[PDB]
Amino acid sequence: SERRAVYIGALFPMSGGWPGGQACQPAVEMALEDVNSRRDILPDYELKLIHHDSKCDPGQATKYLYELLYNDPIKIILMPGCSSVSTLVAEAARMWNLIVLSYGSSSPALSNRQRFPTFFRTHPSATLHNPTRVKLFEKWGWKKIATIQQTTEVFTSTLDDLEERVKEAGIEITFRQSFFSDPAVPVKNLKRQDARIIVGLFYETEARKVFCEVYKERLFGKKYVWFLIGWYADNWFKIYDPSINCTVDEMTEAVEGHITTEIVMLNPANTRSISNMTSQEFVEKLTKRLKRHPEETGGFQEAPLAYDAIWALALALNKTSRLEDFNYNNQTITDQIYRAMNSSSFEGVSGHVVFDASGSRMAWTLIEQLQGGSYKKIGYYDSTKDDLSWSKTDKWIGGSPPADQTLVIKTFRFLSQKLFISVSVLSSLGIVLAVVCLSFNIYNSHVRYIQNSQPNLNNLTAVGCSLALAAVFPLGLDGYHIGRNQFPFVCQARLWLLGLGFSLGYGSMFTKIWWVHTVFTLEPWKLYATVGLLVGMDVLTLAIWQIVDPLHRTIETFAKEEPKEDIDVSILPQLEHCSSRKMNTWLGIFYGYKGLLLLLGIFLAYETKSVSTEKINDHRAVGMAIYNVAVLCLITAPVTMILSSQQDAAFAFASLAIVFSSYITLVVLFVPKMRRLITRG
Amino acid sequence: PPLSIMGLMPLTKEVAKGSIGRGVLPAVELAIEQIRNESLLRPYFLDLRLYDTECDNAKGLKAFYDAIKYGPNHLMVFGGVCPSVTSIIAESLQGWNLVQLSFAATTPVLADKKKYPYFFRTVPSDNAVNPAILKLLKHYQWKRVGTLTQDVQRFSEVRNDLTGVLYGEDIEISDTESFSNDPCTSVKKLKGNDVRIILGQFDQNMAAKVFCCAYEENMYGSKYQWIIPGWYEPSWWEQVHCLRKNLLAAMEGYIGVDFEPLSSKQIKTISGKTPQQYEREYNNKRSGVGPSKFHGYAYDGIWVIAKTLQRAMETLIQDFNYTDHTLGRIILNAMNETNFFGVTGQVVFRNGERMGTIKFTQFQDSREVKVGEYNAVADTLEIINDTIRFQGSEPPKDKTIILEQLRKISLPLYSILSALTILGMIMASAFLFFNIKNRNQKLIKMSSPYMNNLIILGGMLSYASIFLFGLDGSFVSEKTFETLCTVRTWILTVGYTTAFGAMFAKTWRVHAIFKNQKLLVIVGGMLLIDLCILICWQAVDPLRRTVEKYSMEPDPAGRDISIRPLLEHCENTHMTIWLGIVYAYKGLLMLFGCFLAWETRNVSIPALNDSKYIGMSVYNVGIMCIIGAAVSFLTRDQPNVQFCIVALVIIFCSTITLCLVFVPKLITLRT
Ligand SMILES: CCCCCCCC/C=C\CCCCCCCCCC(=O)OC[C@H](COP(=O)([O-])OCC[N+](C)(C)C)OC(=O)CCCCCCC/C=C\CCCCCCCC
Ligand SMILES: CCCCC/C=C\C/C=C\C/C=C\C/C=C\CCCC(=O)OC[C@H](COP(=O)(O)OCCN)OC(=O)CCCCCCC/C=C\CCCCCCCC
Ligand SMILES: CC(C)CCC[C@@H](C)[C@H]1CC[C@H]2[C@@H]3CC=C4C[C@@H](O)CC[C@]4(C)[C@H]3CC[C@]12C
Ligand SMILES: CC(C)CCC[C@@H](C)[C@H]1CC[C@H]2[C@@H]3CC=C4C[C@@H](O)CC[C@]4(C)[C@H]3CC[C@]12C
Ligand SMILES: CC(C)CCC[C@@H](C)[C@H]1CC[C@H]2[C@@H]3CC=C4C[C@@H](O)CC[C@]4(C)[C@H]3CC[C@]12C
Ligand SMILES: CC(C)CCC[C@@H](C)[C@H]1CC[C@H]2[C@@H]3CC=C4C[C@@H](O)CC[C@]4(C)[C@H]3CC[C@]12C
Ligand SMILES: CC(C)CCC[C@@H](C)[C@H]1CC[C@H]2[C@@H]3CC=C4C[C@@H](O)CC[C@]4(C)[C@H]3CC[C@]12C
Ligand SMILES: CC(C)CCC[C@@H](C)[C@H]1CC[C@H]2[C@@H]3CC=C4C[C@@H](O)CC[C@]4(C)[C@H]3CC[C@]12C
Ligand SMILES: CC(C)CCC[C@@H](C)[C@H]1CC[C@H]2[C@@H]3CC=C4C[C@@H](O)CC[C@]4(C)[C@H]3CC[C@]12C
Numbered sequence A: 001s002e003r004r005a006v007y008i009g010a011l012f013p014m015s016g017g018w019p020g021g022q023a024c025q026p027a028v029e030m031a032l033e034d035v036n037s038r039r040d041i042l043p044d045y046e047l048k049l050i051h052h053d054s055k056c057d058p059g060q061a062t063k064y065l066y067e068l069l070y071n072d073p074i075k076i077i078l079m080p081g082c083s084s085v086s087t088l089v090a091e092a093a094r095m096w097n098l099i100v101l102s103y104g105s106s107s108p109a110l111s112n113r114q115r116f117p118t119f120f121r122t123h124p125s126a127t128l129h130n131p132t133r134v135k136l137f138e139k140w141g142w143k144k145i146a147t148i149q150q151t152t153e154v155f156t157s158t159l160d161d162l163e164e165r166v167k168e169a170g171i172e173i174t175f176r177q178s179f180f181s182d183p184a185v186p187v188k189n190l191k192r193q194d195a196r197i198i199v200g201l202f203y204e205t206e207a208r209k210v211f212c213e214v215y216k217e218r219l220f221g222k223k224y225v226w227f228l229i230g231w232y233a234d235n236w237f238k239i240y241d242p243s244i245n246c247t248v249d250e251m252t253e254a255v256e257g258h259i260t261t262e263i264v265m266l267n268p269a270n271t272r273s274i275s276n277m278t279s280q281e282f283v284e285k286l287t288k289r290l291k292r293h294p295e296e297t298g299g300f301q302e303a304p305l306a307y308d309a310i311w312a313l314a315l316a317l318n319k320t321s322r323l324e325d326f327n328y329n330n331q332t333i334t335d336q337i338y339r340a341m342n343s344s345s346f347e348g349v350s351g352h353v354v355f356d357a358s359g360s361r362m363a364w365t366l367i368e369q370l371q372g373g374s375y376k377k378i379g380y381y382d383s384t385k386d387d388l389s390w391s392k393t394d395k396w397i398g399g400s401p402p403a404d405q406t407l408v409i410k411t412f413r414f415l416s417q418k419l420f421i422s423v424s425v426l427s428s429l430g431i432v433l434a435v436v437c438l439s440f441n442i443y444n445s446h447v448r449y450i451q452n453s454q455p456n457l458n459n460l461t462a463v464g465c466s467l468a469l470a471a472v473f474p475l476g477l478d479g480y481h482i483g484r485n486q487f488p489f490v491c492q493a494r495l496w497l498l499g500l501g502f503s504l505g506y507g508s509m510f511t512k513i514w515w516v517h518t519v520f521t522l523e524p525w526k527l528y529a530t531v532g533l534l535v536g537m538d539v540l541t542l543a544i545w546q547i548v549d550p551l552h553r554t555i556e557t558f559a560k561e562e563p564k565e566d567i568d569v570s571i572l573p574q575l576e577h578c579s580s581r582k583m584n585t586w587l588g589i590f591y592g593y594k595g596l597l598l599l600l601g602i603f604l605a606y607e608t609k610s611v612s613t614e615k616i617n618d619h620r621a622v623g624m625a626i627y628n629v630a631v632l633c634l635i636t637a638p639v640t641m642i643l644s645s646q647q648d649a650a651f652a653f654a655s656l657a658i659v660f661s662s663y664i665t666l667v668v669l670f671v672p673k674m675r676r677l678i679t680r681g
Numbered sequence B: 001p002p003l004s005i006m007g008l009m010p011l012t013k014e015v016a017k018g019s020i021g022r023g024v025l026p027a028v029e030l031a032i033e034q035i036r037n038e039s040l041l042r043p044y045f046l047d048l049r050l051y052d053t054e055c056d057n058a059k060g061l062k063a064f065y066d067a068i069k070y071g072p073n074h075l076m077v078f079g080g081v082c083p084s085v086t087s088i089i090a091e092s093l094q095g096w097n098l099v100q101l102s103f104a105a106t107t108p109v110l111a112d113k114k115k116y117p118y119f120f121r122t123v124p125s126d127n128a129v130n131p132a133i134l135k136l137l138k139h140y141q142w143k144r145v146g147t148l149t150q151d152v153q154r155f156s157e158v159r160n161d162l163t164g165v166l167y168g169e170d171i172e173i174s175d176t177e178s179f180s181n182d183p184c185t186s187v188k189k190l191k192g193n194d195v196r197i198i199l200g201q202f203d204q205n206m207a208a209k210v211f212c213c214a215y216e217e218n219m220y221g222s223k224y225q226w227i228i229p230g231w232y233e234p235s236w237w238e239q240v241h242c243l244r245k246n247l248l249a250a251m252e253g254y255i256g257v258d259f260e261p262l263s264s265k266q267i268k269t270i271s272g273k274t275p276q277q278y279e280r281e282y283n284n285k286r287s288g289v290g291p292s293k294f295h296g297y298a299y300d301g302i303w304v305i306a307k308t309l310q311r312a313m314e315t316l317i318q319d320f321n322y323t324d325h326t327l328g329r330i331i332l333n334a335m336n337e338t339n340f341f342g343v344t345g346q347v348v349f350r351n352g353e354r355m356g357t358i359k360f361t362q363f364q365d366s367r368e369v370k371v372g373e374y375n376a377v378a379d380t381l382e383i384i385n386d387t388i389r390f391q392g393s394e395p396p397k398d399k400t401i402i403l404e405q406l407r408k409i410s411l412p413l414y415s416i417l418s419a420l421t422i423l424g425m426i427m428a429s430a431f432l433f434f435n436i437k438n439r440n441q442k443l444i445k446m447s448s449p450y451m452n453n454l455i456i457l458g459g460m461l462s463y464a465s466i467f468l469f470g471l472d473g474s475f476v477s478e479k480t481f482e483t484l485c486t487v488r489t490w491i492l493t494v495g496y497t498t499a500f501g502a503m504f505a506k507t508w509r510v511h512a513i514f515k516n517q518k519l520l521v522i523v524g525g526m527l528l529i530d531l532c533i534l535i536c537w538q539a540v541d542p543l544r545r546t547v548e549k550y551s552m553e554p555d556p557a558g559r560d561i562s563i564r565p566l567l568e569h570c571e572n573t574h575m576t577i578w579l580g581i582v583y584a585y586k587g588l589l590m591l592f593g594c595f596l597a598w599e600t601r602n603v604s605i606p607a608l609n610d611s612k613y614i615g616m617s618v619y620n621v622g623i624m625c626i627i628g629a630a631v632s633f634l635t636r637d638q639p640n641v642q643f644c645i646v647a648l649v650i651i652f653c654s655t656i657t658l659c660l661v662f663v664p665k666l667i668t669l670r671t
């Protein structure tokens, strides 16, 4: 029946770092007129405002807080605008049992219920940008994100929150940086670091310097994606600034195509709020009340926050409603109004007003992207229901978002296939001839001509040629045919077949030449014992090589062979191998031993060139063979060592040497005897 | 007519910092009563009303407001201990025209006279130890020190101010670290840069962790010196929770810095009582309550107000409400002009900061002890010359004094091997004379004499080579060293090639004659091949001297004397392939000669009467050459033993082949 006054203590910043009050005062003084004339909201009590100009200064705001608290009438709530004054009043209020309600306090520190037990704010914390960003990351599959920030408490707290926000979603912040006024060295570290998804937290003035340093560094383009804050002016990169040498068009090149996030401080739809107003009607009525133009009035995009804050306080008072007897020493009314506020949910000019557990308002975030020197809204995000409305109006260079990092396709260099096939066919044909000459020699062992020459030694030579020819099959094949698993048996078969082939094939010839030489200065006992000793020494050396240092697959890496006219993913080639752990030292003793043996064989075969003995008839032809063998072996011995890389040429040299040696040895030894047995019968 | 002083400070026994607020209440009552006795502010009298803040920002602000409302009009604010309340009050002081004078706020933040224009303090800020520490670095000439800071704004301010304090001086911060919970990582990081003197900024709890971390890295003892804060509690190392005895070991020698509680000068103060008399008065009056370091800083505080108010009365007070601006400005100037000797030393303010004393202490075997003190008003340092003790003789050095000495070949070993070489060369010269003298005789005529003389020349050249390749490069200059590295290669190659060409040509012709002038053509062809190889080696890429630096192993003292053995090899850019081809070309020929000698050891030709012993000679040369080359390349790092082995190999090989070839001839001719 009686309309009793209920006073609000409001601190409006009329100047300072954030002069939001110039539009925040009328937006409140309008809202009260809407809350008072409505007889269904608070029919008994009438809301009023006793406000003071804080100037966004704690030192100047403390005196006015004292003037409010220690002067009648009694205030039921406070309203600090700026962040620092808001923190001071939210810390001091609990001694008087007063709820604090802010509209423009965006510091993340104000969500600490231990220091500020009775604080609420309609303006969401800056940390609200984080749940959107991570979602966008999951929208495009980025997991390596670097961060650059300006040394300030708000951006620092935002980064500390973002670390734990990205930890939950399984993302990694690889590289972090900071700078007070000059961003040169952090952007240089970023460009060195090769960071793809960069999140930058800095003001507008530092933003221009940062992006012109980026234009110098060329940290823009296709690969690099940037996340910035979105409450700048629209043409910030086109604002003239003499502190930057980088020019306007260079900034249009650099900044263009970056993503920005900003809290939606006005309902995008055309619905009506509880005040029976729309967004456009509210803006019209406000600019009617404003004494200056909206672009000049400070805090114009914050005024709906003040309107919804007054409406939330009105609804809280209406829920509780007993309010005529508020004293600073009663906590009951404070807890009741707290429970009224904490349970707030209503549709105002800025949208759905609901406060989280820590008193911060949960609201939409608009995600825009700079296209063609202007901003185009690409999406909206609601973190409460975690719903991401997409308009499909964003753009990227290759039609898709850039990748979070370069993937490295490991390609495998395989030996050519036609080469391997041709050489294998040649080696098989050669093995066929070893079969023919072997059988021919074994059949005619009763004849006297072949009886004179040592036929078992020529048979051993043919067997050695056959084994060395068959060793070309495993020595050619690589992972293309074997795969990772069976490869060690392949390397072992290569080693053993080649070793025993050389052992028999050359031991028979060296034994023939030695035992002609020793006779020049005869019975088969020692002739067989000699080849026995040689093959045994070879087998023991190879067995030591096996037991001590068995061979195995080992991959060799190469330099990045990027293909052009394609996407930024480096191709890296690997050349398979298989080697003992110390193979140079191991094959060293073997090559030295065999080389000394071949050289001594050449010398003995030359020393016994003209000598003639009946029990070894073919020995001179053997002399013609050893030379070729030795020569090929020498010319093929270090070359394959030199050409470890370039697997194709190495296989060509090695296998052609093997084939030529085997063919020439089989011809020189067996052709003359064959034609002498043919033509004479 | 009372003059009120709004004095804010914690008093409740529940708050932890209460020992501050009560601890200075005796000294305050010491000053005030004195001011009431001597009658300085007459007719006015000082009346200090006390107010509790409880070191909570809300309760402090409420106490401040209750003081402003329910109390008489106070003239000045006094007190403020914990930084939050004092900051919130000092910032808003300008709204009531009240100047504040604190005695316990140590935050550097209150130095900004644009934000806190009315705030003064008689206690030095936390960063005042920086201009002191700097002078100490100038005293011991420590120019390389690393900083280890705790990740807190309180110590981060001191760490950041240290950089601006060292600026413009000859001090370099070699390593900067910051830590929050585990300092050991930053400890090993600091040790990575080879720092010896560290400047740590952290609380008491982190102190034990950082000191055990220094224990682990052996960052203690002789060569290391820590500089840490000194306001730690006494016996702080004894905290139940790292080993204890190891803790007392690693802590020993660290230097702590703090502010001086009372002036050490025995001079009369403004009140007419020396600091020791005031100390005794305070200790008597505070009979129950425990002492606080800030007690003197409260005493002068009252004086800093009292004299100030006197100057205020000089300029002209009951009229003062909190609206009076000119009176506030007058009192501000009067406090700014404060210059007088009090119990804590000279009291003078520079931009609202007290210009005071710093105290340096050091741990000794159980406890901390004063070692020095710095006067910031005179910017001078005064160290008690004797009480400072160091494990080593002198203060440890900042950087490592590494002297790259050059490893040398032993002089006696070189001299004895040289004497043996001259003896062997005299023997070779005697054998050559014996050969040339008996040339007409038949038995010397049978064995090829020219080849034997070529063998003597080979041995003699090898001996000169053994002179050469032990010069060590320390005896001679550098350019002479490179020229001699080339000369010794020439001389050894020629002396080996001729000496073995003779023994190879002889066995070759023995073998050839058994199978069925020119010998000199054989040796000449070998010489031509070696000459072509050497001239190619010299013209394409000549040998140059290079220095190898080893692992810095030794420390032959209790000093910080760390020497890197600088050894000296003369080698080519691709010298591996050159040496490989030379060794292979000669080893194949040695094996060839050995095989020929074994083949023909049984043949007897009168045209070469000494083929048999030449067989054993070529065996000697081959075996000794293999052993010498292997043991030479296997011991590149040790010059002495390698030179001894190679010299003995050359000497024994050459002398034994010369003896084998020439002795039987003389045993026959002399008998
Ligand atoms: C499984 C391994 C296979 C090896 C096969 C062995 C083949 C060897 C063949 C030829 C061996 C002879 C061939 C000689 C050609 C090489 C001479 C190069 C000289 C040179 O420029 O120096 C380079 C290098 C630097 O190293 P460094 O350590 O820094 O030296 C500086 C040390 N400082 C103290 C000053 C710091 O020194 C060397 O080459 C070391 C050479 C050792 C001597 C060789 C042995 C001589 C033997 C007999 C001498 C002959 C006697 C003659 C008989 C007389 C008959 C009567
Ligand atoms: C004085 C200086 C030199 C003297 C030496 C002279 C001659 C050699 C003497 C004896 C050789 C005997 C056995 C071979 C021993 C081990 C084989 C190695 C294991 C392996 O399997 O081969 C490893 C890497 C793997 O490298 P990779 O991964 O690139 O291969 C993948 C390709 N797809 O290959 C290579 O070494 C290339 C393979 C080495 C080839 C050696 C050349 C032999 C030439 C001709 C043979 C003549 C036959 C005699 C018939 C006589 C009839 C009377
Ligand atoms: C690296 C080179 C030098 C090693 C060569 C080893 C040579 C010398 C070995 C291998 C085979 C050996 C022969 C094996 C068989 C016999 C028969 C025996 O009743 C007398 C020894 C004799 C005749 C051996 C002589 C030495 C020999 C020829
Ligand atoms: C009769 C037989 C036993 C004599 C054989 C002589 C052998 C032992 C000699 C001749 C060639 C020499 C090799 C020459 C080259 C190299 C490559 C190097 O990176 C490791 C040492 C190594 C591998 C050497 C080891 C010893 C070696 C293999
Ligand atoms: C370790 C290797 C190089 C040893 C092999 C050395 C070779 C090159 C030696 C061994 C036997 C030598 C041959 C022996 C005898 C003759 C006949 C003579 O009227 C002309 C030189 C000639 C033709 C020699 C040429 C060089 C030769 C072939
Ligand atoms: C890597 C290099 C050093 C290896 C070369 C090895 C040399 C010594 C080999 C390769 C070719 C060989 C020659 C091949 C052909 C003949 C013809 C024959 O009727 C006499 C021996 C003779 C003349 C050989 C002597 C030795 C020889 C010259
Ligand atoms: C450097 C040193 C080791 C070289 C010394 C060379 C020595 C070994 C030579 C020089 C003179 C030689 C002596 C000459 C005379 C004779 C007398 C004869 O009836 C017995 C042998 C004997 C005793 C010789 C033995 C060897 C000998 C002592
Ligand atoms: C790889 C390296 C070790 C091979 C070096 C080859 C050497 C041994 C060759 C090159 C020149 C050759 C000499 C050239 C001239 C002749 C004259 C001939 O009537 C006897 C052999 C003899 C005296 C040769 C001996 C061997 C020789 C010295
Ligand atoms: C290239 C050089 C180093 C190889 C030298 C190999 C030497 C050591 C070879 C060549 C001839 C070989 C000899 C050949 C014949 C016999 C007779 C036999 O009943 C005992 C072993 C014995 C006595 C051999 C011992 C080793 C031997 C002397």
Ligand SMILES: CC(C)CCC[C@@H](C)[C@H]1CC[C@H]2[C@@H]3CC=C4C[C@@H](O)CC[C@]4(C)[C@H]3CC[C@]12C
Binding pocket: B616, B619, B620, B623, B652
């Ligand atoms: C200081 C030590 C290591 C040097 C040793 C040098 C050795 C290798 C020399 C010294 C005496 C030499 C021996 C002299 C006598 C003979 C007898 C002859 O029928 C076979 C060779 C043989 C057996 C020689 C082989 C090499 C030999 C043993």
Ligand SMILES: CC(C)CCC[C@@H](C)[C@H]1CC[C@H]2[C@@H]3CC=C4C[C@@H](O)CC[C@]4(C)[C@H]3CC[C@]12C
Binding pocket: B594, B598, B619, B622, B623, B626
């Ligand atoms: C490069 C070096 C290691 C090659 C030298 C090989 C050596 C070990 C060879 C070459 C000549 C050989 C000697 C030849 C002659 C004989 C006489 C015989 O009744 C006993 C073995 C003995 C004493 C041999 C021992 C081994 C021997 C000294």
Ligand SMILES: CC(C)CCC[C@@H](C)[C@H]1CC[C@H]2[C@@H]3CC=C4C[C@@H](O)CC[C@]4(C)[C@H]3CC[C@]12C
Binding pocket: B652, B655, B656, B659, B660, B663, B664, B667
């Ligand atoms: C410093 C060392 C290596 C030098 C050693 C020198 C040795 C090799 C000398 C000293 C005494 C010499 C012996 C003296 C006497 C004779 C008798 C003669 O009819 C055959 C040679 C023979 C048996 C000599 C062989 C070589 C010999 C043993």
Ligand SMILES: *[C@@H]1O[C@H](CO)[C@@H](O)[C@H](O)[C@H]1NC(C)=O
Binding pocket: A040, A041, A318, A319
């Ligand atoms: C105000 O409170 C009354 C009491 O229940 C309620 O009926 C009314 O809906 C409230 N006003 C609004 C706008 O919700």
Ligand SMILES: *[C@@H]1O[C@H](CO)[C@@H](O)[C@H](O)[C@H]1NC(C)=O
Binding pocket: A322, A325, A329, A330, A331, A332, A333
């Ligand atoms: C607030 O609390 C005081 C003391 O408990 C009490 O006297 C007063 O009635 C309370 N106010 C209301 C509206 O109940």
Ligand SMILES: *[C@@H]1O[C@H](CO)[C@@H](O)[C@H](O)[C@H]1NC(C)=O
Binding pocket: A342, A343, A355, A356, A357, A358
């Ligand atoms: C409202 O207060 C209750 C009481 O603690 C709390 O459990 C609840 O979470 C608050 N409301 C919201 C939306 O957090």
Ligand SMILES: *[C@@H]1O[C@H](CO)[C@@H](O)[C@H](O)[C@H]1NC(C)=O
Binding pocket: B333, B336, B337, B351
């Ligand atoms: C205080 O005095 C000092 C020197 O006496 C002077 O530099 C400073 O400006 C003064 N501060 C004032 C007048 O606020």
Ligand SMILES: [Ca+2]
Binding pocket: A230, A231, A232, A233, A234, A262, A368, A375
């Ligand atoms: Ca925008």
